[PDB]
Design a protein around this ligand. Structure first.
Ligand code: JYO
Length: 270
């Protein structure tokens, strides 16, 4: 069936994502392969079929909402699974985008960061915790100026209780995980968005080493507004309880008067 519905193009960019076309309507797709031997967390669909957690998570967050990458279909194979993902065209990941432009202007960082917050909120609303929010896991739909979360491969069902496992990016991980190998989903997510926002306005992440993470001292290597500095420092509070909630972030003075995605595209992307 797969090869009957999708024309496979070349590799894109340890992960295995190929360019693809849906032969039905020539819709651009991405084809992610995951080998069963490499899967740590297994979920179960309503039908009680054993699938990778990523399928569960993508199925739970897959609706009208443009802020998360839509899982169009998936397949079981003897030794692997194959996820069909939407592919914007043209498209750039936020890592390559920040690398090319360096530090983003606050206005564009605000629009991008707002869109990421809206997307993370949607995930949380649908019982999904991403656990690997970072520039690489954000695609820019360059025409529409819309960001899309990708890679729920380290994700989990959202729970209000302690997490004692983590398979995400260390330099984006919060001090409580480094020190005590324990975190709560939302507060840890606010940490990673702190790192992300720092990365957007400074053109690089703030911390390389465990000691730097644990100390949580933030040096700005670029001119960044006082209000943006405050929001970053707040997201990056050492004590989880001291971190802002999603509501508190989106009500922060820095987050006000956000550009519409189309506005953002017109001004900053073309
Ligand atoms: N480091 C990022 C993580 C890699 C590995 N895990 C994943 O779950 C993943 C999914 C995709 C992806 C999703 C939708 C469209 C898509 O196509 C597009 F890039 F837009 F052309 C790719 C990529 C990926 C992104 C960008 C470049 C290469 C792969 N990834």
């Amino acid at each position: 069936p797969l090869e009957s519905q999708y024309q496979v193009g070349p590799l894109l960019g340890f992960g295995s994502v190929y360019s693809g076309i849906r032969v039905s309507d020539n819709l651009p797709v991405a084809i992610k392969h995951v080998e069963k031997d490499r899967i740590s967390d297994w979920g179960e669909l309503p039908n009680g079929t054993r699938v990778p957690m990523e399928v569960v998570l993508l199925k739970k967050v897959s609706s009208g909402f443009s802020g998360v990458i839509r899982l169009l279909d998936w397949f079981e194979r003897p030794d692997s699974f194959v996820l069909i993902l939407e592919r914007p065209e043209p498209v750039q990941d936020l890592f390559d985008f920040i690398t090319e432009r360096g530090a983003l202007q606050e206005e564009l960082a605000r629009s991008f960061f707002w869109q990421v917050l809206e997307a993370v909120r949607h995930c949380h609303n649908c019982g999904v915790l991403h656990r690997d929010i970072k520039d690489e896991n954000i695609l820019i739909d360059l025409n529409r100026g819309e960001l899309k979360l990708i890679d729920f491969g380290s994700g989990a069902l959202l729970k209000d209780t302690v997490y004692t496992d983590f398979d995400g990016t260390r330099v984006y991980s919060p001090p409580e995980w480094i020190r005590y190998h324990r975190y709560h989903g939302r507060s840890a997510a606010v940490w990673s968005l702190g790192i992300l926002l720092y990365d957007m306005v400074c053109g690089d992440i703030p911390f390389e080493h465990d000691e730097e993470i644990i100390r949580g001292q933030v040096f700005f290597r670029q001119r960044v507004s006082s209000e943006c500095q405050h929001l970053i420092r707040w997201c990056l509070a050492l004590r989880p309880s001291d971190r802002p909630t999603f509501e508190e972030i989106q009500n922060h003075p820095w987050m006000q008067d956000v550009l519409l995605p189309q506005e953002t595209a017109e001004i900053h992307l073309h």
